[PDB]
Structure 1
Amino acid sequence: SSSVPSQKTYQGSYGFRLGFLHSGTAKSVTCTYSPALNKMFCQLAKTCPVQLWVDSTPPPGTRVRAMAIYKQSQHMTEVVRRCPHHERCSDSDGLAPPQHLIRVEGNLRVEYLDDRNTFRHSVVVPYEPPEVGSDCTTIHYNYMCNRSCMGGMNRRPILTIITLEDSSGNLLGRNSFEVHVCACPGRDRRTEEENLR
């Protein structure tokens, strides 16, 4: 058996889009997003801000789900999970399953799912509208393995799929971005952009 979650962009009725801080590539940055590569460069277990931008307010009870998938075609059917080492280092925050790559930081309403049919992991929070004078909603994700992990991702590129779903789980919108968890995001981003013709 196997299945592959859709990664098709779907802005949907509420005009759902993702946004990221314009953080630059100084060596000290804790994370940084490349618009040219649609790629977020971030660090193990550290804050990774992702912004939700909507054009109109979704219904009450809307939820925001994050799920990782392998980028390379030949690995798409493989569930992305933490490496054995990090799983064993028993470092759950008391909410997150130790096998889950993606956590949410700073939200006590976070919910984690092991899908009993597809075996995929995901993390979901209630959708909240922006604060007054803010134009987006920010979620702090943490990625709990990097590209230096042996086993688990094992150096392979991944994407995060962000889904807006209603209270009944129906699809309202979907977006995605590549994630590269590394030691020095600023350096990795600048280097990877240096190639661009």
Structure 2
Amino acid sequence: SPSNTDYPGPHSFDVSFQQSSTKSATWTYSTELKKLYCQIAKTCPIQIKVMTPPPQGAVIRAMPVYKKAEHVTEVVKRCPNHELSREFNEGQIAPPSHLIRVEGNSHAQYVEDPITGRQSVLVPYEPPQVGTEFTTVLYNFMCNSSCVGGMNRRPILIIVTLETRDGQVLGRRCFEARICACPGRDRKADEDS
């Protein structure tokens, strides 16, 4: 069952979240809590930062997995309802079963591991734009973290991993993901807890 410990690796790999506006309540992040609260199917900008240029076909794989020990062995797919619902799939090219999607990147390739059957999504690594210090990747989470027949409100967490073009892990960072309806409210309540 895939590792979830932070491992900076030779390229000082790192992921962070910086707010796209100046509200914009579509999502929010508890650096303190290592939790990302965000709305379903909406877009989440995630900042990647290295300290030294990674290898060649270097890729960034984002994989979802249940937080709690009891479920870790269960794959994380979209609930039956959404995996068919006309919406979010109609003009889509991405596997309707996959939870995690990346928008704005034709090269993005979705993958199901033949043995573990674990779904994940990869994007070829490209350095930041000139004058920019972050490579930004656009993720989309396709099921509330409470879809019955899916996560059924079981905490999950994302494992973004920087890997060599032939799957060797060069770096890994994790954060708990909780896709809902009122990221604002929920984060707030979660913090008063």
Fold match (TM-score > 0.5): yes
Identity over aligned residues, as a percent?
Answer: 54
Q: Does 1:73 align with 2:69?
A: yes
When normalised by structure 1's length, the TM-score is 0.92
For residues 147 and 118 of structure 1, the distance between their equivalents in structure 2, rounded to whole angstroms, comes to 22
State the 1:22 CA deviation.
4.5
State the 1:9 CA deviation: 1.1
The one-letter code of the counterpart of 2:127 is P
Deviations 1:38-95 (A, max 9, x none): 0001011000111111111102211100100000110000001110000111443543
Q: Is contact 2:67–2:157 with CA below 8 Å preserved after alignment? A: yes
RMSD, aligned CA: 1.5
Q: Distance in 2 between matches of 1:126 and 1:143?
A: 19
1 CA distance for matches of 2:168 and 2:183? 35
CA distance in 2, matches of 1:80, 1:144: 11
Tell me the residue number matched to 1:153: 151
Gaps of 5+ in 2: none
Which residue does the alignment assign to 1:169?
Answer: 167
Q: After superposition, where does 1:126-141 map in structure 2 within 5 Å?
A: 126-141=124-139
Q: Distance in 1 between matches of 2:15 and 2:146?
A: 27
Structure 1 residue 190, shift from structure 2 partner: 1.5
Q: Could you list the per-position Cα deviations for residues 148-183 of structure 1 after superposition, in whole angstroms to 9, with x for gaps in the alignment? A: 411110111100001101112111101110001011
Q: Distance in 1 between matches of 2:70 and 2:62?
A: 22
User: Are 2:137 and 1:178 aligned?
Assistant: no
CA shift digits 1:15-57 (9 cap, x unpaired): 0011101479x4x510110011100010110001111111111
Partner amino acid for 1:165? E
- How many pairs does the alignment contain? 190
> What residue is the counterpart of 2:123 in the other structure?
125
Q: Which residue of 1 aligns with 2:10?
A: 13
Within-5 A mapping of 1:51-66:
51-66=47-62
Partner Cα separation in structure 2 for residue 102 and residue 78 of structure 1:
16
d(CA) in 2 for partners of 1:31 and 1:23? 10
CA contact (8 A) 1:69 1:160 kept: yes
Contact 2:146 2:154 in 1 (8 A): no
Unpaired runs of at least 5, structure 1: none
- TM-score, length-scaled by structure 2: 0.94
The range that moved more, 183-192 or 38-47, is: 183-192
